[PDB]
Each structure stands twice: as C-alpha cells, then as structure tokens.
C-alpha cells in the first residue's frame, strides 16, 4: 500500500483553571 | 508500486483544564 | 496500490495553567 500518512496535529491546549477561592478574613 | 501517502492523522485530544488557583490573601 | 493508511493520532494538548489566585478575604 501507500505509506502511512503524517502524524496528527497536537491537540488544543487546555483552558486555564478557575480562579481560586476568596482568601481568609484578616 | 506502492500507492500515495495516507491522509493526515487525527488531531490529538485537547489538554485538560488547569487546576483551580490558590486561595487569595487574607483581608 | 491502495493509498497508505491514516497517520497516527496527534499528541494531546498540554494541560492549562493553574487558575489565578482568588480575591483577598
């Protein structure tokens, strides 16, 4: 047969995680 | 002879979402 | 000949970065 095709593109980068919780009272 | 090269591979899976950020500072 | 088979699946994307710090308390 023909040779295999080229490797696929790298996946999309993941989104940044959510903001952290509000800090404690001071 | 051999045929032409195959089609491109599938795009990779998306990366995971990052973790939650740190707790904020004290008031 | 038959055309070649598809290429291998791409690598996964990188995990996203950690989130921003939360607001002050």
Curated annotation (Swiss-Prot), chain B:
Origin superkingdom: Eukaryota
Post-translational modification note: Proline residues at the third position of the tripeptide repeating unit (G-X-Y) are hydroxylated in some or all of the chains.
Modified sites of kind 4-hydroxyproline: 8, 14, 20, 23
Protein's cellular compartments: Secreted, Extracellular space, Extracellular matrix
Chain's role: Collagen type III occurs in most soft connective tissues along with type I collagen. Involved in regulation of cortical development. Is the major ligand of ADGRG1 in the developing brain and binding to ADGRG1 inhibits neuronal migration and activates the RhoA pathway by coupling ADGRG1 to GNA13 and possibly GNA12.
Record remark: domains: The C-terminal propeptide, also known as COLFI domain, have crucial roles in tissue growth and repair by controlling both the intracellular assembly of procollagen molecules and the extracellular assembly of collagen fibrils. It binds a calcium ion which is essential for its function.
Associated disease: Ehlers-Danlos syndrome, vascular type: A severe form of Ehlers-Danlos syndrome, a group of connective tissue disorders characterized by skin hyperextensibility, articular hypermobility, and tissue fragility. EDSVASC is an autosomal dominant disease characterized by joint and dermal manifestations as in other forms of the syndrome, and by proneness to spontaneous rupture of bowel and large arteries. The vascular complications may affect all anatomical areas. Polymicrogyria with or without vascular-type Ehlers-Danlos syndrome: An autosomal recessive disorder with a highly variable phenotype and onset in early childhood. Disease features include cobblestone-like malformation of the cortex, polymicrogyria, intellectual and motor developmental delay, small joint hypermobility, vascular fragility, aneurysms, thin translucent skin and easy bruising, congenital heart defects, and foot deformities. Early death due to vascular dissection may occur.
Family: Belongs to the fibrillar collagen family.
Subunit and interaction comment: Trimers of identical alpha 1(III) chains. The chains are linked to each other by interchain disulfide bonds. Trimers are also cross-linked via hydroxylysines. Interacts with ADGRG1.
Designated name of the protein: Collagen alpha-1(III) chain
Protein's organism: Homo sapiens (Human)
Gene that this polypeptide is encoded by: COL3A1
């Amino acid at each position: 047969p023909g040779p295999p095709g080229p490797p696929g593109e790298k996946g999309s980068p993941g989104a940044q995680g959510p903001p952290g919780p509000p800090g404690p009272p001071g």
